[PDB]
Amino acid sequence: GDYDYLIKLLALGDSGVGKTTFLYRYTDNKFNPKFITTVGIDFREKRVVYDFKVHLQLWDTSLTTAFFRDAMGFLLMFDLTSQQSFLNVRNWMSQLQANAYCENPDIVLIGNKADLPDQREVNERQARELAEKYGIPYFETSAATGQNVEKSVETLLDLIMKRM
Numbered sequence: 001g002d003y004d005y006l007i008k009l010l011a012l013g014d015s016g017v018g019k020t021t022f023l024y025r026y027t028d029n030k031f032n033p034k035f036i037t038t039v040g041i042d043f044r045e046k047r048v049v050y051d052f053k054v055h056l057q058l059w060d061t062s063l064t065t066a067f068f069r070d071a072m073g074f075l076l077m078f079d080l081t082s083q084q085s086f087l088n089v090r091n092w093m094s095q096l097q098a099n100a101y102c103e104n105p106d107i108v109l110i111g112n113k114a115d116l117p118d119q120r121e122v123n124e125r126q127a128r129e130l131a132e133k134y135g136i137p138y139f140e141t142s143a144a145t146g147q148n149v150e151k152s153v154e155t156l157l158d159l160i161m162k163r164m
């Protein structure tokens with residue numbers, strides 16, 4: 001423990017895609033909360049109610065902002081075996097840009113579950129184009145195998161190190 005930079009990367013994408021497994025494979029056992037408190041503003045009032053006097057609280061229908069907080073690079077991720085998750089990239093990208101530190105931060109496009117060719121619904125060309133539309137690297141990965149799992153974070157880190 002004698003380094004020089006501490007930098008934050010965010011993985012974002014639909015449930016299933018392999019974020020949890022991807023990181024887990026890229027890292028190895030780190031079940032450790034970083035933590036703070038969180039607000040829950042709620043109104044209150046002191047009603048009287050004969051059948052007593054009741055005080056009562058009034059709640060209503062967050063952390064998201066706290067996740068994109070400081071995130072200097074993004075792993076935009078989908079499931080190669082799911083045409084649906086590929087389409088949702090359009091939408092994770094939207095709320096990414098809305099929350100990030102900058103309008104175009106550093107994203108690497110990750111197609112995961114590359115080890116399931118039999119179950120594929122997303123083609124190389126498709127992704128490559130979206131990637132280029134946005135103008136960012138693309139990586140076909142597997143959390144199961146390790147395919148490109150490192151190269152993808154590394155291409156990300158390498159990018160977030162362009163300064164001035």
Ligand SMILES: Nc1nc2c(ncn2[C@@H]2O[C@H](COP(=O)(O)OP(=O)(O)O)[C@@H](O)[C@H]2O)c(=O)[nH]1
Nearest residue numbers: 014015016017018019020021112113142143144
């Ligand atoms: N074969 C394969 N399975 C995967 C891969 N990534 C995730 N999975 C599986 O997908 C399921 C859910 O993915 P998980 O990462 O845990 O949830 P997520 O973080 O929301 O994407 C688990 O049963 C994993 O075994 C992959 O790259 N290859």
